[PDB]
Every structure is written in C-alpha cells, then in structure tokens.
Amino acid sequence: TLSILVAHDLQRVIGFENQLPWHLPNDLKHVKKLSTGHTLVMGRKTFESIGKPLPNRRNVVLTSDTSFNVEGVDVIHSIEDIYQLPGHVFIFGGQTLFEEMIDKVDDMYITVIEGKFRGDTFFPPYTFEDWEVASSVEGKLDEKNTIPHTFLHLIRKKLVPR
Ligand SMILES: NC(=O)c1ccc[n+]([C@@H]2O[C@H](COP(=O)([O-])OP(=O)(O)OC[C@H]3O[C@@H](n4cnc5c(N)ncnc54)[C@H](OP(=O)(O)O)[C@@H]3O)[C@@H](O)[C@H]2O)c1
Ligand SMILES: COc1cc(Cc2cnc(N)nc2N)cc(/C=C/C(=O)N2N=Cc3ccccc3[C@@H]2c2cc(C)cc(C)c2)c1OC
Numbered sequence: 001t002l003s004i005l006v007a008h009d010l011q012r013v014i015g016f017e018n019q020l021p022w023h024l025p026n027d028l029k030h031v032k033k034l035s036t037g038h039t040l041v042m043g044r045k046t047f048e049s050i051g052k053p054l055p056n057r058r059n060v061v062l063t064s065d066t067s068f069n070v071e072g073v074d075v076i077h078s079i080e081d082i083y084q085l086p087g088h089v090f091i092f093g094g095q096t097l098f099e100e101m102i103d104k105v106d107d108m109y110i111t112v113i114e115g116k117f118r119g120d121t122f123f124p125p126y127t128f129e130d131w132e133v134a135s136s137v138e139g140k141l142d143e144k145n146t147i148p149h150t151f152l153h154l155i156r157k158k159l160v161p162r
Contacts, residue, residue, distance in 0.1 A: 004101065005109045008113065010113070010114060012122045014093065015094060015119060021118065030111060034090065035090050046097075047070075053070070058085075059074065064077060091105060108154045131154035131156060134153040138150055
C-alpha cells in the first residue's frame, strides 16, 4: 500500500518556517502508531526539520543531493524509486512530495487541524467527491492537546460508469 500521512489545518496549511505550526502531541502519537514497523518517504526539507530519523521504521529521504548520507536513513533520488519500496509506504511530506504523489496514492491518513494557522506550505486541494471517508474520528482534547482535530482515513474512489 502507498499512503499519504499528513496533518493540515482548515485552509490546508501544513507548515510554517520548516516547522509544524501547531503543538499537538496526540497527532505525533497518531503518526507513531500508523507508521511504526513500516516506511516513511519524505523530502529533504522535511527530514532536516525533524533532524534525525524516527525510530522503529524505515526512513527514506528523497533528494537530488548525491552526497546525502545519514546514518539510519535510506536515500532515493527520483519519484520512481518510491514504487520499488516494499511494504506499507507512507508519503510523509512535505508540500513538494504531497503535490507529486496525491494523484498516485491509494489512500490518505489526514489529521484535520480544526483551526486557522499562519503557514507558508500547503497540502494540495482535494475534493471529497474523489475520496471515500473510510473513518473519521474526533481527537480527544486535554491539558496537552488543546486544538480540535479529526483523524480521517480517505480511500480513493473508483471511477464507474453511472
Ligand atoms: N503538517 C504535516 O503533516 C507536514 C508533514 C511534513 C512536512 N510538513 C511541512 O512541510 C514543509 C516542507 O515542505 P517543502 O515542500 O518545502 O519541502 P519537502 O517536500 O519536505 O522537501 C523538498 C525537497 O525534497 C527533494 N525532492 C522533492 N521532490 C523531488 C524529486 N522528484 N526528485 C528529487 N528530489 C526531490 C528536494 O530536495 P533537494 O533540494 O535536496 O534535492 C526538495 O528540495 C515544512 O514546513 C514542514 O514543516 C508538514
Ligand atoms: C516538520 O516536522 C514534523 C513533521 C511530521 C510529519 C507529519 C505530522 N503529522 C501528521 N499527521 N502527519 C505527518 N506526515 C512529523 C513530525 C514528528 C516527529 C517526531 O518527533 N515524532 N513522531 C513520531 C515518533 C515515533 C517514535 C518515536 C518518537 C516519535 C516522535 C514523537 C513521538 C511521540 C509519541 C511524541 C512526540 C512529542 C514526538 C515532525 O516533527 C515535529
């Protein structure tokens, strides 16, 4: 399976100055539970923002840098390399990789951050006419998680005659 994994706000903001605009620990635990034991594919800028690979999963970084080499990170240099990765592959970001892959993935795990943040990077527009809501689960709010959010699992709809 090839999946998108993303958090975006009410206006599809995903980042500001190479950081998540929001502080929401519950969504990082969501990311952890979905992607442990599988593969994350991310662009170079997204990797440098995190700074080190996330433990207990394959970390794949897409870059044009022939010199790129980080311990615990596998490097690919073209989009076509993604389809050769085994197992469940999650497209992890950022805007550039999302734009290149949104028309190719089987499904999307989207955390909708129910707010309006200042951003400089965005998830591409998409329509629920094209995507079936396999599940929609409201995140629970508490002391450390104060922004309403919704976990969506969207599966691409099949085009059928009538
Ligand atoms: N909210 C979320 O769920 C989420 C998730 C991830 C990231 N983000 C945010 O997204 C922002 C970064 O997005 P971004 O688009 O600016 O950067 P990005 O997609 O993370 O990285 C872009 C880089 O990836 C490499 N790349 C992309 N496509 C390629 C291709 N076809 N072939 C070879 N290399 C390729 C290039 O690296 P080189 O220039 O080294 O060749 C390119 O400069 C950050 O603010 C981050 O916080 C948000
Ligand atoms: C730009 O910056 C980033 C972007 C994204 C992309 C992304 C965010 N959300 C959605 N929904 N989709 C997305 N593709 C992720 C991250 C997160 C990286 C991070 O440190 N952990 N993540 C998972 C993890 C797994 C195992 C051990 C440690 C972690 C760690 C973490 C886990 C837990 C349980 C709590 C905390 C506080 C951290 C990121 O760094 C801020």
